[PDB]
Design a protein around this ligand. Structure first.
Ligand SMILES: O=c1ccn([C@@H]2O[C@H](COP(=O)(O)OP(=O)(O)O)[C@@H](O)[C@H]2O)c(=O)[nH]1
Ligand SMILES: [Mn+2]
Length: 246
């Protein structure tokens, strides 16, 4: 039922954790694309659409944290997966990342971001490895720096980061359906946000995330099923005032 799976597939169940708010066109293409892609690669999976329905700025990392907590307690691993980044090459390892976190959307392959420590887009971890990092920071509202920070959590935890090798498709490895004019990145740094972005967050993450699920809805998109989680993220306006206005 819950898991798309056949008896012959390897046992590891992947939760696809998709940070989401107002990307409907993209969602329509993404869900069946990922059902097809994962099924051909024989990966047991379920797709969680993590829909931010509070009115705070978009918090990718906090949503991933929520999806981690709210996914089936029998998932073995997670892929934080942008909704607009579609894998076109089946050589990409979406299998269980046993030796360490696996960064699918490598800077060698990503259309826009090419620096060594970029871990955005699509990144896979075993549940144990994600907990070892205490998940992602909750302090990043708006576009930017939540991934750079998580990189530091991975490194600090002594986890080795893996990337695809021998991929030949280069910058055509993914379809990045993202018009920068229609989908404007919320990149404004509001006051003290421009400082805290690069800080060394020592306290919080997976164990301090403040939220509640408003609704949970089964959604099927052209045959391909998923679970939409309507997520209300709390904001301590004292700690992070840059959460509001947008
Ligand atoms: O308002 C937003 C902001 C981002 N996202 C999600 O977060 C991902 C990363 O955002 P974005 O695509 O803007 O980052 P970039 O293209 O720079 O990698 C998107 O693909 C979406 O899955 C979203 O759903 N709504
Ligand atoms: Mn994008």
């Amino acid at each position: 039922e819950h898991w798309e799976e056949d008896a012959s597939w390897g046992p590891h169940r992947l939760a696809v954790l998709v940070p989401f708010r107002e990307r409907f066109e993209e969602l329509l293409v993404f869900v069946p694309h990922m059902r097809r892609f994962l099924s051909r690669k024989k990966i047991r999976h379920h797709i969680y659409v993590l829909n931010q329905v509070d009115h705070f700025r978009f918090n990718r990392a906090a949503l991933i944290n929520v999806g981690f907590l709210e996914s089936s307690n029998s998932t073995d691993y997670i892929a934080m997966h942008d909704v607009d980044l579609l894998p076109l090459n089946e050589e990409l390892d979406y299998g269980f990342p046993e030796a360490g976190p696996f960064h699918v959307a490598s800077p060698e392959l990503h259309p826009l971001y090419h620096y060594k420590t970029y871990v955005g887009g699509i990144l896979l971890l075993s549940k144990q490895h994600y907990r070892l990092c205490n998940g992602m920071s909750n302090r990043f509202w708006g576009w930017g720096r939540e991934d750079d920070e998580f990189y530091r959590r991975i490194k600090g935890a002594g986890l080795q980061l893996f990337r695809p090798s021998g991929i030949t498709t280069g910058y055509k490895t993914f379809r990045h359906l993202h018009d920068p004019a229609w989908r404007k990145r919320d990149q404004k740094r509001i006051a003290a946000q421009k400082q805290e972005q690069f800080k060394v967050d020592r306290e919080g993450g997976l164990n301090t995330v403040k939220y509640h699920v408003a609704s949970r809805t089964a959604l099927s998109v052209g045959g391909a099923p998923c679970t939409v989680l309507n997520i209300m993220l709390d904001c301590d306006k004292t700690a992070t005032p840059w959460c509001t206005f947008s």
